[PDB]
Symmetry: C4
Subunit: 94 residues, 4 copies
Amino acid sequence: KDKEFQVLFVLTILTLISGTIFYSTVEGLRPIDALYFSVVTLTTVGCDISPQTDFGKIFTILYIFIGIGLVAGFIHKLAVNVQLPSILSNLVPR
Amino acid sequence: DKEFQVLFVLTILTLISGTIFYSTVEGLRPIDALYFSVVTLTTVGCDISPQTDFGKIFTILYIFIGIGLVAGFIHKLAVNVQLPSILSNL
Amino acid sequence: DKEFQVLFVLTILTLISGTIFYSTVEGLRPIDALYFSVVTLTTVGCDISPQTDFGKIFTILYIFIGIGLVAGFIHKLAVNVQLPSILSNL
Amino acid sequence: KDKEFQVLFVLTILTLISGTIFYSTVEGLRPIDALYFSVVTLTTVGCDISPQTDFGKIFTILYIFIGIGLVAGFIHKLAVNVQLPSILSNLVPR
Ligand SMILES: [K+]
Ligand SMILES: [K+]
Ligand SMILES: [Rb+]
Ligand SMILES: [Rb+]
Ligand SMILES: [Rb+]
Ligand SMILES: [Rb+]
């Protein structure tokens, strides 16, 4: 078990929870839409919508700067600790 | 190089999976479904988004499932594409 | 850590430079100019684009000038932000 | 002088030239807008516009897959061979 991976996972879940609550409260999005906006923002995919309120713009700025680094670290650890071992195991002739 | 070959195959299958899902669930044309799948997993982004809740949840999982895969494929593809030029001018 | 400090400063100045340019040349409000600068250099992207040719050329140069800087800053910021949690649960 | 950096530079310039010509021809954009769309696409920033024609969609797909890797490699080499040495030199007390 990788502690760095566990922390990055919990931090990402809390980050996405925080984003969902914020955008559904301040920007008036449905929780599902708020979660989607948080995910596509922190993975840098982006969305067709932007925050309308100045508070949403400021939060999104800070959210982006801390969130991108965490999610990116989680995606890296997810690739090397889970997806890559699973791919390798699944390529073994049995 | 079997490393690049497997990354290609995985990327193809992932993109196929997205094209099928978005063309059937989100009603996009196949070419538009593929485009959405590609720009989503490469993080270029689109000027549309899934309008169904089912499509939103899928795109979230689709991103985490495929974003790292496509990143690895783009890297290996870059190496193979530029290596002839590096070797020629060297 | 002076490494993180200099990356912070450089990022601040780059973002300030974009906010000034986009608020004056592209007529955005300062907060919107900053938002555009941030989402452009982090590659999140925006639902607008510069409408003047001068703004387009600037954003092209602005991307190549700052994209690598912000990437390095986001990495160092990530390390500093998560390191207390790593150490606490270890 | 770094040959890898030189090749990555020339390849990026040719890639952006190719994109500009394509999008101004097939998608009917002004050359400046075509170049902008090529840059923001290959850096993954994205644009508010998407290709309208099916040929533009297919080209953009292939363009993205080859273009992102090259531009990303150029940006890396630009950071380590040019921007970072320049920053370090500019931080030297004189
Ligand atoms: K975008
Ligand atoms: K967009
Ligand atoms: Rb809400
Ligand atoms: Rb044109
Ligand atoms: Rb991106
Ligand atoms: Rb984007």
